[PDB]
Amino acid sequence: TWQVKANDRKYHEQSKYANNAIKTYKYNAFTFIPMNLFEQFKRAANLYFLALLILQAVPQISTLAWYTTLVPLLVVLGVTAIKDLVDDVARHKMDKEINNRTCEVIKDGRFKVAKWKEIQVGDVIRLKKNDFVPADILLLSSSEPNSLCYVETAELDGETNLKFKMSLEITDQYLQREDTLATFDGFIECEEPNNRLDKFTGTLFWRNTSFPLDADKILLRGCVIRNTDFCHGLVIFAGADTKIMKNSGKTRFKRTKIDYLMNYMVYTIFVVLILLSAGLAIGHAYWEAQVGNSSWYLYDGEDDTPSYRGFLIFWGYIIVLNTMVPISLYVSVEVIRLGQSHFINWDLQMYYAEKDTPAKARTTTLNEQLGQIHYIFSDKTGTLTQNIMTFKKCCINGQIYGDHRDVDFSWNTYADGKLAFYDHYLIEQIQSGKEPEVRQFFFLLAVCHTVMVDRTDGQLNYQAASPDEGALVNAARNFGFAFLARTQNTITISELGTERTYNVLAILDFNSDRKRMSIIVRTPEGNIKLYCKGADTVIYERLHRMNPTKQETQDALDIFANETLRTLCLCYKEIEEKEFTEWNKKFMAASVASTNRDEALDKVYEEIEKDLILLGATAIEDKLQDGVPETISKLAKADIKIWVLTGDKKETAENIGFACELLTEDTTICYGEDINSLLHARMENFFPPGGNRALIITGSWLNEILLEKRRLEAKKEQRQKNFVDLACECSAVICCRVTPKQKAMVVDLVKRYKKAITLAIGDGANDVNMIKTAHIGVGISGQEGMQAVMSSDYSFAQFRYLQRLLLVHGRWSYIRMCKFLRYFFYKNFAFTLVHFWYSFFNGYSAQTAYEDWFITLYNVLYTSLPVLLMGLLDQDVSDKLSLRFPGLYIVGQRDLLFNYKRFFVSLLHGVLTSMILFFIPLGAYLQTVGQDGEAPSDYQSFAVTIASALVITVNFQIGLDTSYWTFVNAFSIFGSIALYFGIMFDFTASNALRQPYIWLTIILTVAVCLLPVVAIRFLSMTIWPSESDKIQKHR
């Protein structure tokens, strides 16, 4: 059990306590270079090229120079190494800033300044207003009565509203002063460190008495102390034990599905490479036995048995056929990846003008995975919504206002200008004062609330625990009725610029079941009013007969509910003098603990709020980000399922779900109670909710549903799969009140039990764990912390830009990458397999069919640029057509462009091209090429003929593959051929290409390689046209 001793730095120094310093970086200044263990082992290609470099080093077994393998290998390793270095160096800066944060500590006798690193468990600290909490501390005292404190848990959940916290009663009345804190010695036996944020189990042993502790007395590390001058607490969990850091996952190396596929494709190529080389090695051993040993012209000394001769070339043929997996493929992928990522940054349609922030591809490796997405997990506050909650409409008395009929707000000074009210009739009525209902309506908003004033630098800023009250009180200020300030016994409000101090005599509280609030305020004249406010259902249950506005407001509430506006009914009463005085004695008697204080308070509360007269109803708007409902529908047409994981309340999460149109009137909402019955039913036995189409679960229900010995592990494995199976067959899933770690476990659950590619989008530290867990992590810009942005792969400002990231950049990047991979293998299998066929005509001696200077420059000059441009400038359809037809995105979801079938078809294409490229020149030379004194039929001419036919064929193939023929694309395809035929015409080899037969052989070889392809490509689209083909055909 965790034990904490106050003001004792050496109580448990007798390691298990973690110092308050954090460590998120991965590489030190020494263990950075050993990252090669990560680069080499994870990707088998890097190991293969390392084997080649070692293999080509030994002169005994060599056929190609090694300087052409080291330089590209350093580029492949270098670029990835620098990318990880800059990312990790950035993580060092974040840790340094957090660690170097300043605080105050009870050192010996006094409060002396210290950094966040120097904080340790059992350390008493003092925190001022607007200071970050440095560790999980037990609140002891504060600057305001009852040691009452407020915190902004923006990192635990994305909400900004203040959270209410208290301290122990005994500690409140003794630890107010610094001197008593210095000598404070309290022993705490609390729970072990954990990631649960809403629960805390512990007791404070102090003054020979035990006092239980709850979550309402513990301030966590991600909190910000607000609206309180100072507070004191002793650290309990520090550094890595803090619940925020337990709610944080590791930064993994994220790589794309295609990256994993290439590993499996490359494994097969190794098997063929060993089998081809071994088969040719065996043939040489046989050939050396029969023909080689009896060939006097081949004698070379160094008598080697044919078995040894066969052994040596096995490594020779490994080097000859090394480009079956070419290093140029991975050097070129990085160029493709970097270019595709800069198109996200350069996008003017993903650039937010007013905030002046473009998109940023913070990870350049995952471009083609944006075209693979199956699930999107998104935050609510700040991601789907703007986090702005304004007062839109009100049914004052009987009439409905805020209808743009006939604002400057200059008539009142307190008007900040945040409100965008357009109706002018309401403003006229307020100033006119003809109807007293209008004055009382906004007076109630400025009275019945728990909102709190700041009054900092002459600004009348408001802070509230409930955003609804904060919006209503802000609106009341704009309409003259400004809530100036409140003391314990009175509340001061400016009625149209006139100071008026009301002495409140009783403040009714708000509860989840109560669903309302009221307040008894005595006007200065002497009258007593019960200003009430709450939900429509509970309020109407406590009306009286004479109310003639029951029907009019009921219709107004329906109108407000139609446009998804949160509503509250307003009421007032006219308590007499003696009636309250008799009841005040009863109410005061109910304030004591007595037995429970819950039943007594509920009983007296119900009698208080009888016979209420209505003033109207309000309609608050929780603004959605622009283009959110249009984006959610658009991404749904791409068969992308969007789950909303939010740290907010269920009521607000569901309301935004309707506004986003994730939930509709057709959807039937399944709650946590409904799910548990079904999951249990399947356990004791596709789900019936397949037609229900909605699922709203709280973080508490997630723990029970996930249930977080050998048989127990099986139940854990089974229960998780059952929930994921049920949840995935729902149109919308909204998870509310989930911790940052619960956000990630939901992403991980879909990743494991569905093999789906997941995208996590959000803002703030709440979403960093799922941003780090998902295959693609997007950070919405706007938070000054920039914590979700910094941990994200991509980062733009508006949710609506998810359309262009997925349907344009992700869709194209998948097409361009798959096209690049399929061609790059073809052009190298068609190139390196000519040596395989020539082995049968040279004694399996590992002699190459090309000149040495052609083997080096093939992938460098003659076939390099055209595929890079096709991998950067190829578009099947324009951006406008990409967004008009989201159904094109499904092509990448199902992996229809790169597969085992598609990869092996490119090997068959390459194997047949190399077969044709060798055996037509062979036939044309076995008998007679144009033969005279100045003639080919040499080995140089044979190598020139295949190289010329190979360069033209592969460069013509990329022309067929290319669908976006820019001038740069055209120049490179014909420029690559023109460069090959320019280098070998003095800017021997040129001699072959001046003969009619040498050019007739090349023309024949090219056509036999290309014409069957043109037929198949045309035949493929005519009987099996693709979605892109139909759009382009009908374009």
Binding site: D347, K360, L926, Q927, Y964, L1004, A1015, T1022
Partner: protein
Amino acid sequence: KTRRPDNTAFKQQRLPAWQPILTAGTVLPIFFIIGLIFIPIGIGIFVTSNNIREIEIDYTGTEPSSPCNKCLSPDVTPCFCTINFTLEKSFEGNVFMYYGLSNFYQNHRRYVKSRDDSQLNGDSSALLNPSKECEPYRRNEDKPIAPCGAIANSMFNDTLELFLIGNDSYPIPIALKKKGIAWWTDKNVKFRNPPGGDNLEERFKGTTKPVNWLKPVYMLDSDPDNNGFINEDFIVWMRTAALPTFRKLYRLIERKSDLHPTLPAGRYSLNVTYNYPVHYFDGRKRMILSTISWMGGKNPFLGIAYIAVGSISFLLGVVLLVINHKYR
């Protein structure tokens, strides 16, 4: 974050471009124009190749009952054979005399590399220091081999002569030019004698002959312009071949001054000095006489290949046309 991205066609992915689509109006014709060009080309090559008079004589002497089997076991090193052949049709124009070798892997990796191109280029430093590349024939016993390597050592060294058996039965030797049988670049650029001196004897001082050569490289030919590394026969051999079955140019028979055929049809006898042993590895020596043609040599393969590929394009063109019409 930063300022607005600048608006350019490349950066906004809106470069002016052309979107080709494989329509029936574009692929159907090329499958017919290609077929219409590959058929006449195939006929043109095929007919011209058949119009070449060529006689090939295999004097390896492996089979018994042949008048050259005595040289397979040369008790006396100088061996001679006489092969009688007849030309039904007289040859016309220039006639090239090749020698053919079969099952002779001149494209072996262990063999193609066995040379010192620097020494052949006429490098004094490399003349006495042949590279390790020609390791097996670097130095004979004490001093370096001038034509180092297995390629130069195993040089074809049979002497072939042609005699015309006239009506009088008296053989008529036919003039055979041994010049101009190598590439112009080979003679004047790639292959050169070592610098300095005027006599080839002095230039090649302190350099032994190859092991298998009977006489040094000094007197490969009496003509000073055809001896040394610039010797035509030596140059033709060192220019390696691509496949085991190959033929190399040996002699030139220029056009006769008179209008009569260069080799009038009749009786001919090949007098060959059997020196090169090839029967150890089942090789077969040959002698080829061919007549020049303006359209290259005699290649029946290409002509047939164009006919096949040219005809298949029509089949694909018709099949694609028929398939389109069904799915139009």
